Amino acid sequence: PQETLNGGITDMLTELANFEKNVSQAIHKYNAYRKAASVIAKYPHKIKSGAEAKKLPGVGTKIAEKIDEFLATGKLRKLEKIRQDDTSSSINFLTRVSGIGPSAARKFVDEGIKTLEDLRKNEDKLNHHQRIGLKYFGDFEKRIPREEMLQMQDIVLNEVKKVDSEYIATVCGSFRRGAESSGDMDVLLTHPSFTSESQPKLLHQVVEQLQKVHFITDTLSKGETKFMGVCQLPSKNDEKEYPHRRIDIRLIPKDQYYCGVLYFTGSDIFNKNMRAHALEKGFTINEYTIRPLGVTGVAGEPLPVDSEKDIFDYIQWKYREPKDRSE
DNA sequence: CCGACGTCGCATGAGC
DNA sequence: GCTGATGCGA
DNA sequence: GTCGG
Ligand code: NA
Ligand code: NA
């Protein structure tokens, strides 16, 4: 299915989605619109009527109406209006700064701050995270080609191992599924000395090392189990310098590691299928553990998990490679 | 008709 | 000062 | 906004 099929529609729905999230502060309306956009984006026919579209799950009466209007007129009146609305288009825009959510963007536009220029004139109203998001606004909205991701992995695995050879680290996300590009780097981390029934420096030392070799350049947030920050590949001599990229590193108990890896590998749709499965086989799977129900439905103790495959075994699925976890 | 729609670590605000 | 709600991002 | 108990 090509973009040129129903692209106008999915763009429209995605625009609408973003105003719900950032302007109207209606996060469920936001996800409803994205859900419709997504199911439509998969549908392999150019849509002819909102009635055709309504058949899809996630598309109801009100989106069917909008599709009709768009189909007949080539636009949506409501969207046209909000696009031209100075206040709301500015609120929607500021949220593209990482750390500026709908509430902070609301406040800014309230006092006159509407543009990146205005943000740059008012640094002392920005918190740490927001300032970082400003500084790297453009880099962050760029994608990371897999070749850079490989090079970033090399550095991450090398430096983690050098800190302590018993650490285990996995770059997950769409990268681990084989994607030709990524939006950030998600690293999952563990160590034999850290279990559920079990230093608070296991994460610190790794981050410190990645800072020391100047891979990690900034810190959005950091505590004993989750680090969120900025990184950058070393400049290849006289070449153009690489974009700064987003990198998360989280520490996970060794006995919850692979549930974490399975889950943060995705995809989202695969995760729902697999956890749907799953239930119907007598087990409940979350990001942490797999547990058995329960004739009355009462979940028992977490089951020992020592590989991704272990989880597949428990619910008699054949282990599926990350490459084939598209859904 | 009407509630669910994921959940949670961390930074920062607010209330005491 | 401590506690615990909220905003944010994933 | 959409779904579903
Ligand atoms: Na429907
Ligand atoms: Na943002």
Could you state, in order of their start, the residue ranges of all structural domains in chain A?
Answer: 3-85, 86-142, 143-263, 264-326
> Which segments of A are annotated as binding site?
54, 56, 59, 95, 97, 100, 143, 174, 177, 183-184, 186, 248
The CB-based long-range contact list for A126-130 (8 Å cut-off, 24+ gap) reads A126/A99, A127/A99, A128/A220, A129/A98, A129/A99, A129/A220, A129/A221, A130/A97, A130/A98, A130/A99, A130/A100, A130/A104
| Header resolution in angstroms | 2.5
A43 C-beta neighbours (distance < 10 Å), count: 19
Residues A308 and A235: their CA atoms lie apart, in Å, by 36
Residues A74 and A123: their CA atoms lie apart, in Å, by 41
Residues A320 and A327: their CA atoms lie apart, in Å, by 11
The second-level CATH assignment, the architecture, of A143-263 is 2-Layer Sandwich (3.30)
Task: State which CATH number among 3.90.1150.10, 3.60.15.10, 3.30.210.10, 3.50.50.60 fits the domain covering A264-326.
Answer: 3.30.210.10
**What phi, psi does A294 have (nearest 5°)?**
110, 90
A17/D1 CA-to-C1' distance in Å: 10
A171/B13 CA-to-C1' distance in Å: 34
Residues A161 and A210: their CA atoms lie apart, in Å, by 11
- The HSE-up count of residue A100 (CA atoms within 13 Å, CB side) is 31
Report which of A308, A25, A318, A48 is spatially closest to residue A188, judged by C-alpha positions: A308
Cα–ligand 2 centroid distance for A279 (angstroms): 35
The second-level CATH assignment, the architecture, of A86-142 is Orthogonal Bundle (1.10)
H-assigned helices in A1-85? 3-19, 27-42, 50-54, 61-73, 77-84
A53/B10 CA-to-C1' distance in Å: 41
Which nucleotides of chain C have an atom under 7 angstroms from any protein CB?
6-10
Q: Is it true that A143-263 and A264-326 share their CATH fold? A: no
Give the containing element (helix H, strand E) for A285.
strand A283-285
Residues A314 and A291: their CA atoms lie apart, in Å, by 10
Q: Is the CB of A261 less than 7 A from some atom of nucleic acid strand D?
A: no
Ligand minimally distant from the alpha carbon of residue A105? 2
Residues A158 and A150: their CA atoms lie apart, in Å, by 12
Closest nucleotide C1' to the C-alpha of A131: B11
Residues A74 and A35: their CA atoms lie apart, in Å, by 22
A224/C2 CA-to-C1' distance in Å: 21
Which experiment gave this structure?
Answer: X-ray
CATH fold of the domain at A3-85: DNA polymerase; domain 1 (1.10.150)
User: Could you give the angle at the alpha carbon of A113 between the alpha carbons of A110 and A115, nearest 5°?
Assistant: 135
Q: Among residues A66, A81, A107, A222, which one is catalytic?
A: A66
Cα–ligand 2 centroid distance for A170 (angstroms): 27
